[PDB]
Amino acid sequence: KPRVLVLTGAGISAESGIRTFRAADGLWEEHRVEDVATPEGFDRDPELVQAFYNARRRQLQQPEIQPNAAHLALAKLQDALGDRFLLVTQNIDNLHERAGNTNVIHMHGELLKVRCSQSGQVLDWTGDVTPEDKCHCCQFPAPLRPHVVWFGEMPLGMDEIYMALSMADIFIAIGTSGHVYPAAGFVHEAKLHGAHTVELNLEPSQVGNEFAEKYYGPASQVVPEFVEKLLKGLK
């Protein structure tokens, strides 16, 4: 019955063996943000950036990488709330999909998808991206880039997200750093429209002060314990 909007960050996929920029270093897989997550870095060294996400994409599909209990808990939450549930993620992994979630809004794109340089059309891509690859949507074909939103680019599905933010009875942010905007500002927006805000995190986010309710610790145990408590709450 209550409308629930869930925002997830890199923290929820950390226990599954997927790492992304850390606090102390400010490095992603020992790379600078600016070199692997900007339009400029891609224009400077297309070969390196393409190879970077080639590594990330094939690491994602290793047998050792599995959705953890936090991913699974959110899947059960959708089963219970039906279409009164919306999952928005900053992650480019597919662990929400593997866990059983559907209609997940990837505001920062997906690692298992690529995009045509000029057409903007999106293609499913599981293998490596090579210089020998072009599009089949244009009469004059074009180079392929990862379908990932870089810093300086516009996030995806923003219209649908803000619409859901104003409708949500309960807003839950999971594994978010609070450093990446506009995603970190979502908790604000949710409160103006009267939503109850909850933060579930291993590391308390910088905007954690904001949230009405907080719980901290490993996601695979904090998230299921909150989801299970929310489910029994609605009987």
Binding site: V33, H108, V149, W150, F151, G152, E153, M154, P155, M158, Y162, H179, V180, Y181, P182
Partner: peptide, 7 residues
Amino acid sequence: GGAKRHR
């Protein structure tokens, strides 16, 4: 809204 940004 705006574009993806840090800080």
